[model samples]
Structure formats: structure tokens, C-alpha cells
Target: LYFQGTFAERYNIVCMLGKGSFGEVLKCKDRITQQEYAVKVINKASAKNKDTSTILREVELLKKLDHPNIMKLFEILEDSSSFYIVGELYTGGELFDEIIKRKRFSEHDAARIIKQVFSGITYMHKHNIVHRDLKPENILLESKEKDCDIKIIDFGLSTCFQQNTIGTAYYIAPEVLRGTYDEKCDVWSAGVILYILLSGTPPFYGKNEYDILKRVETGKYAFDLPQWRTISDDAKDLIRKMLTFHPSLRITATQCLEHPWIQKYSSETPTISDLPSLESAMTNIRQFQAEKKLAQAALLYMASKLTTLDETKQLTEIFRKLDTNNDGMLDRDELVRGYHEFMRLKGVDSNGSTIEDQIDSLMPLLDMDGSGSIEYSEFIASAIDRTILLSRERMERAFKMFDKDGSGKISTKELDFNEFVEMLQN
Candidate 1:
């Protein structure tokens, strides 16, 4: 947000997270704010990329990626010898740990996780960027919570987010082993992840990595175990389509997002729900007004930070369905239509009200930033009960977000009294 070339001015390196051939990794905290991050310091003149143009291009693409499930690249800093990359920190550890620890996951949980992964990949592929390197190790959890969001790390190494590309100890697709492949390799990798999600085992296993490669090449695997009996055919079907030996036959991330299984299982929140929640959410949405500006600001900043609420999961899906593209937006009519469908079938009376009378008034506030982009946080804020919105754990995080300097006290000087943004709470 400020000038470059001053990493030390803003952050104090607290510890080493790891090391790489080109540079070191560090855990850093803002000098004023308490939030921490993982910083990668890569040598500017390293032989890995001669003049470092490749590194610059990779960083450039990383800047373009702005999805919730992808790891965020906060900023880049440069000096005489190196480039300091500040990025979101995820300490919940690799997804590999979770899959192995759970022995296998419930269809509901795996579907949720896959939806998030697919969301990130969908965004990447939209921008012509492919991870090219997909694996449980690269897929990380945002925090230690069981329902914490996924943060996919280790982007596509080269400059090209391959319009047409390429990992792994196990998740590599067949065409990749043949030495020719495209972005659909990631979908294949997703199949491997889903396979393990159900069976607690790799699809193509052998005595060694070499034979594992052989099995992956042949593209032979199955849900052959007794436990597999409990898994759904939709999931297994998706896995088959994803693991198709031919990359062209593999499903695209967007298609996977819309797959019937994903439609039903994206969250335990069924696409078709009990509907009373729709009635209840209507009350919450109507009760939430622009007049609650302070609460809106706080809610906007804190909406997506918590996970304990079952409603959190449901409302997330609720917002997803209403938000159309999730990137484009929901106009008043779109939201009206979306809401109309939800409240249909006598589930909730619209009170015979005009759509405009019922909800059109909330449009401006919903599109708070006025970018025509989806105001997801705002939608979620109005959609949820205040009780669900202000859990103590999330409330504490909200405070830290506004506190700015990690100071217990918030002062007027700490806020930017500018034309647009406002600081709502201490």
C-alpha cells in the first residue's frame, strides 16, 4: 500500500519458515499491526533465472490472481540484491496432513474442500493461468480450524499460466507423464485428491514412486474397497471424468463447479434447503439497513473470518447461488429472481409484494464499492443474523482488523478520514 524497497521498515522478520535454493523464507509481523505473514526473499540476480525476468513474470501473474481460496500475494519489495515477497500466511499446514489424519473424509467435507479448490483453480484458469503443480502439499489450510478455508500455494512456476500446460508425488495426470498436457492436468490432480479424500489412499500406488508413475501412466485405479461402498457414485463418476486418461476428456474447473455432485454437496447446505432459513434470511436481509453503517462496516470487514457456525457454511452456499458468477455480480433483478426462486413453493410468502417493493431498495448498499463486482461480504452481512455475525472469536478478529496498530486503543488519527473509506470501531 506504500512505497517499495522497505521491507524492514514495515515488517520485522521473526523467524525462518524454510529455505530455498534462491533465497530464504521468513515469518514476519507488521511493525505496527500484529498480523503475521510468510515472506519469500528471492535473489534478484540468481542463476535460476539469469536476469530474473522469469521470476518477475511469475510474480506479475501472481498479482493478477485475486480469489479467496488462492494464497494472496500482499506486496513485492525490491532492493539491490533481492526481491522480498510478502504473502498471506497459512499455518494450518498442508492438506496432506488432513487427508491422512482423517483416514478419509465425509462426502460433505470433501465436497466443500473441493469446491474451494475448484473455485481458486477456476479463477486461475479463467486468467489463462494454470497451477501446473497441484498436490496436497501445495494446497494448504488457512488455519487450524476443521472448516478453515483452503489456500492453494506454489503457483505455476513459469511465466505462462499455460493456456494449454503441465506435479506431484501422486496427483499427476496421464498425459503429463507422456510429456504433453494442458491445464486439465489440474483437474486430473483434483481427481487424485478426491480419490484419496474417499479412500485414504492414492489412486495409483505401487512399491515405489517409479511404479506409481507406471500406474498413473496406465491410468488404472478404482473405488474397489469395502469402504468405497459408502461413497456416492456421483463423486466416483466425477473422479472418473477427472482422471480420464486423455486430458481433453477431463472436466474443466468451471464444469466441475457446476457438476451435479458439487451442486448437491458443495456444502452440507443442500441447494434445496429446508426453506424456512430463506424466510429467516429474508427477515435478516430486510432488518439490515444502510442506517446500520457502523455495523455494516464492521460486518464487511469480518464476514468471512469464522467457520464454527453451520449457518456460516449454509449462508456461504446461499451467497454463492445468489451471486451469479461470483466474480461478475447480482443485480437487483438477478437477486430478485434468485430470491424469488428460493422463497417459492409456499416456503415463504412474498406477501404478494412487488419485487421492487420487497428488496430493490437494498441494491445500492449491496453494491457498496460500485464496481459491478459481487459485493459478497455485503450480501453475507445482510443475509445472516447478527447473533451469527458476532461470535466472540470472530469479534476478536474484527477488533484486531480495525485496531490497525495492535494497540488496545483506537484513535481518530489511526483512521483515514478521507472521501471514501471509514473506520467503524476500535
Candidate 2:
């Protein structure tokens, strides 16, 4: 039966938002706070063994996450029969729905939306959380207004530092198909989103899953068409970097934010034509969305869940690289220098006290026990400790690492192990 009356003696159900095999989301209002929210009601009997874990994991991640562009989970109410997840209510609906209804869409409009999405994704990645599903359907507008912000939702297919291959075919990264990947999988999905926003079509296409996945594997897409003619070079440059087949080569979210296209056009509105060919992309998107529900359920049931750290050999190699001094320990100076080098690659300035100060603030967490250095054990622990998958104490420690100024506010800049260690210390 539907929850039509008051829930938990506080929230009053207004109407239904949507429903699926797992549960139904209802529009609700908190009587005490006089605030509106969306309450997802899941029947315990309706959910299979696999669905239960995925649902619990989604709740776990959302509970600790706090970002302007990420959906907020306020509270959870449970009974013997069902579980109620209370979250923010977005009246504007899905981003794709808005794009379809708009009379005119532009390059700047697409850039604005992509930038905000990246900002949220960047935050999630910094916390070691990967949102495997990053399609338009998972993005919701906060309001119906033109300037409304979008919120990222649906973490049923997400994981922390996990390399399991789970995502919709249209947005799935090439590396994921091979059964090895990290948070960069989200980056690839975001690239596909950007590509579709600009060209009104997917970078790769086929009549069936096999054909579509083949195209993704080959990493072949075009920029020579009517749509490409009017689009900016800077925009295409970013799409290429993001959609790179090699996960290591793929651009990071912070780098996407710093891209020329994002920096210049995020707020500027540029003229764009109505994409007559967008129908194909929409069809693919719709199909994938429908198929994912069953696929996630089945896949989660069949797959052997594993995190990146589980691959000892690979992790060891990566750790060796980070240990540039060839010593068994990673010290503060080495971390600071490596961080500067990384920022330089992303076109970030390396000559500022801000960077050094940020590093200094983060050192305490990594150096655990006041050793002033990080051993392999300490390094691995910090890298694999996905804040969303861990305890509040761990999450708070992670937050403090990124709060470079110790201002209790985490900066949006890219996070590294050096800073992550500082988080553990707190």
C-alpha cells in the first residue's frame, strides 16, 4: 500500500514522485520544519538480497555527503516492513527533461550544466566515492527557473575505490568493460554527457549492445559534422581528453573545471542550433535507463565485489611511483613536491603559498603517530579509505585534510594523498 498519510508522525506525503521495482519516491513535507522533501519508500519484502545491499550502500554514501550539487539525505525512517529515506525535493525534474522542453539551448548553457556536474563529481572523487552511473537521468534541476542548479542523484550503482564493472552501456567507460577501473569511470561518463549536450548524439552508437560496446572499446568518435562546425575548438578539446579510452589519460574533474571552455563559457550564452538528430541519443538514453534497473540487480548478485586495493600488485606499483625518493617512507617534502608537479600538469600555478599551506595543513593526518612520514601501510589505508564507505570519525578526518586552512571548510581544489593524510590525522 502507498504511504498517503503522515510518516514517522512528522512528514506528510504530498504525492508520488516516481516508482520502480525497488521502491517509490514520494513528495513529502516535514510538518515540524515546514520544509518539503522527497521520501523514498522501499518495501523490505519487495527488495531481493542484492537490492538490499545496494540500497543500504546508497543510503550510506548519501548520508555523509554534503555538497550544493549533490542530493542531500536528511534522515531515514524504518519499520518492520519498509524503509523511508528522506531527501531534498527537486521540482524542476531531470536535466534531460529540461533540455527537451527548452525552446532554445546554447553552448554556454551546456557548459554551465557540465561545470556544475563536474564540481559535484570532483567532490565525490576527492572523498574516494565513485558514482558509476552519471547519466542525465540521474541529474535533477532544483527548480523550474532558468538559473536553477542541478543535483546529482541515484547512487545504487556507486562504490568506493571499487573496480567492479557496473554502469549503463551508453555511459560506461572502456576500462570498465575490461573489469578494472577507479573513480575515473565517472569522468568518462561525464565526457559522454558533455558530448551529447554539444552534438545532440552519443560519441559512439550501434544497433545493439555488442555493437555499441565495440565502438567504446575502439575509442572512436567523430567531430566532423554540421554540429561540430559551429562548436568551439576548446569544447571539443575537453571532450577528447575526458573520453580518452585509457583511464589514466582521462582528464580529472578539477582539470575539466580549469579547461578553457569551462572557464570562459560556463556563464556566457553562445548561440546553438536545435539538434534534429538528438532523437537517436534520447532513444539510447531512455533504453539504457530502463535496462539498468534490472542489470544492476542481476549484476550486483553475480559479481564478486572488490576494491582497487584488493589488487596488491597494482597497488604496490602505484605506491612505488609515489615513493619517488626510493625510500620505504613518504615524507612531507616529497609529497609537497609531487603535489606541485601534479597541479602543474593540470595547468595550476605552483608558485603560491596557498599550495604549500594546504599541504602543511594536510600532513598531520598522513604522518600518523607524529612520525613526520608515511609508510606503505599508512599510505594504502588512506588511499583506500573511501569516506562515504567509512565511519563519521574517518569522514571528519578526511574533511579536515582537505580543509587546507583548517577553516572547517573543504576547498574545491583537487585532493592528493598528502592532503588526505592530514585528514586521517584529525
Candidate 3:
């Protein structure tokens, strides 16, 4: 099922598009509607478990946002064996790759793109959301616009950590590096992104991750003002506020909107002529609208088919019973025990496969909380949703590796407790 027999065999996959850590992306057309869509297909057995949650989070977050400069999710299909996420397909490639090749952009050109990004970020923050990973690679051009019209994409590392160090090491803010922050972290990252757009290089670069991290920690990075001196005081000031090492001193996105650099361009005359013809814009907009509606319909249909809360509540109780100590969670062992018990209760063999095979089947089933670490709540959540497809034998092996302490339960201390907490707070 690697190629999955093309979309023509079933739905009609028009062409392979891109590849990522998880799987391949394909451009497809519906056989019946003849409508086009971008489908990201991931094979269950080959995909990393962490990537699965990232995709899920992206879907959940995209559903709550509405901004012209942000990519929209179309639909997601997930089961025991595979996952498919559909999104509005724009043929233009990543803005990061493009900018890298072009070196730097003019002040006016950069301003146009920056304003659009600000609008998207402002809207996200207003909704209590954050786009933690704000790199050029995560940005895409939706049309052949002369003024640099773009959309923000990718949310694998985006979270409500508020003010934690969870972005790429180089672009992260000092407060984030020290593990204390909020929305300002994104502001810092965005500033770095803008710096690259204006100057052709990240404001700071280290020989390695640690060197970069150290510079970020001490707020030692500086700008080559000669390069930016002619860009406009407003632009320089914006860069200064964004790259400020202290989160408390760094200007917020709201403040950025008010900055003279942004206000100047935002108030400037609409340069539609600098962009593609009206016909192309209309075509892209219409295509985007159609994809959005269909995605909405598919998600609604899937949600309707899920089990009721009452049933989930009862199944959750069964999960709790297996979670021996009731720490409001289940470690790998507890999950394995629960799985075996369920199978035994159903008159099935408790031992049927190699430890590795058993673990392959079970860990994904119980790691329901989506922290990449299994906990009791996740065990209950997955069981309630009927997404637990792993077998008992596999569960036993996975638990052994996950549980650093032979004592059985996978305690916080056993799983790099201090580092994990530091990462969360960071």
C-alpha cells in the first residue's frame, strides 16, 4: 500500500508533492467531484509516533483559526493503520528556500510580507494560541504576488507553553532559552525571520547548537547596522524590539503593528497591480474556499461517528482500574497489564508474539495523552476512542524500554524527570 494504488484506483492521486519526517504528500483529485486537494499520507507502521501527534495538533489548531495569511487545514483521516491530512494546496514552494536563494529583499518588499505575518500572529495570540515555530521554511507563497503575499504553515512545535523554550535553538529568545516566556517568544522568532528577510542571514550564528544557545542566553547577538542603516529607522527599531534578549523588554506583536515600519506599509495604497492578475487571485480564492468546505464536512462527519461521552466515561473507568495507584495516569506497565487483562477476558492468548512486535503494537495504543510519554489519562482516552490497536504481547516489550526503573511503573524520575520538566518550562 506504499503508493496506495493512486487516486485513480480509488480517489485519484494526481502527483507526488513533498516529503517530511512522517511521510509523503500528494496532490489528488476527487474522482466524482473532479476537485483537487493536497493529501498528506502517512503509513502507520513506518511513521514516527511523535509525528502523528504533530499532525493531529495541526488539524485541531487550524480548525480554530481564520486568517488570510495562514494556511487552512482541509481534512484528516486517521485509523489504526494509517493517517491522511488534507490541506489547501498552493503550488508555490516555501518562502524560506526562496529568500535564501534571493539573498535579501527591499524594505518595501519585506514590509508587505511582514505585515501579513503580523496579522496572522496577532489573530493567533488574540485567540490564546501561539505559532512557536516561525521560520521561513514554515512560510509559503499562495500566489505569484509581486508584493510577496504569503501564508504561514506548519505547527508541529506550536503549543500553549505561553513562554517556554520550544522553538528552533537559533531563532529562540533569551527568556525562552532560560525557560521562562509567553507570546513574546514568537515575537523574537518572528524578528529573526524578518532579519533574515532584510539582511540575508540570521542575526546570529554559532559554530554549533551550544554556541548559538549561549549567545541567545546572554543576549550577546548584534546587528550589522551598516547593512540596515538605509532600510529606515522604523525597520531598524522593529528589529531591535524583536531581537531584544529580555522577554520583558521585547515588544509584543500588538506593539509591532503600531511600529512605524508596519503602519507605513499597511496604510500604503493597495498595489494589486504589483501582484498577479485579478483572475488568478479569484481562482486561488475559490479553490481555497472549496477545499475548506469539503474539509469541514468530512471532519463533522467523523466527529458524529465517534462514541458518546457516556460510553467514553465508562470505558475510562476501566482504564482507571488498570492504573493501579490511580495517580491520574498509567505507565507502560500498567497499560500492558490492562491490555493483557482485556485480551484474557475475551478468551485470547496473553502471550503471542516477540517482545519487539508486541511493543510495536501496544505503545502507540496507550500513549494517548500525546505527550510522547504514556500516562493513565492517555490510556483511558485512547481506549474510549477505540484507537488502541496494539496487542498485549507488544505492550510488554515497549514498557520494558520506556520504564528506566526495573521497579515496573514508569515514574517521572525514571524518564529524565528534571530535563523533561526543564524542557516544558523552557
lDDT of 3 by residue, 90-151 (tens): 66678876786788988877877777677677766776767766777778876554443477
TM values, all candidates: 0.69, 0.57, 0.55
Candidate 3 regions with alpha-carbon error over 4 angstroms:
1-10, 43-61, 156-168, 179-181, 268-426
For model 1, how does the per-residue alpha-carbon lDDT over 1-426 read when each residue is reduced to its tens digit?
244336776678899987632467789987655567788787655524434566666776775454558876766776777688888777788898897688888888888888888888887888787777788888888778666778888775444221221136588887777676578988988889888887888889777788889888788887887889988899888888888887777789888887888778653322556466566767777756544766655565555433233355556555556654433234576677766677564566664457666666677666566645444456666777766555444555445455555556567876422212223322
Q: Rate the local accuracy (lDDT) of all candidates.
A: 0.69, 0.62, 0.57
Candidate 1 vs candidate 2: which has greater TM-score?
Answer: 1
Report RMSD for candidate 3: 21.8
The TM-score obtained by model 3 is 0.55
Stretch of 10 with least lDDT, candidate 2: 300-309
Candidate 2, 153: how far from true, in Å? 0.3
RMSD of each: 7.3, 18.1, 21.8
Error of 1 at 153 (Å): 1.3
Q: Output the lDDT of residue 150, model 1.
A: 87
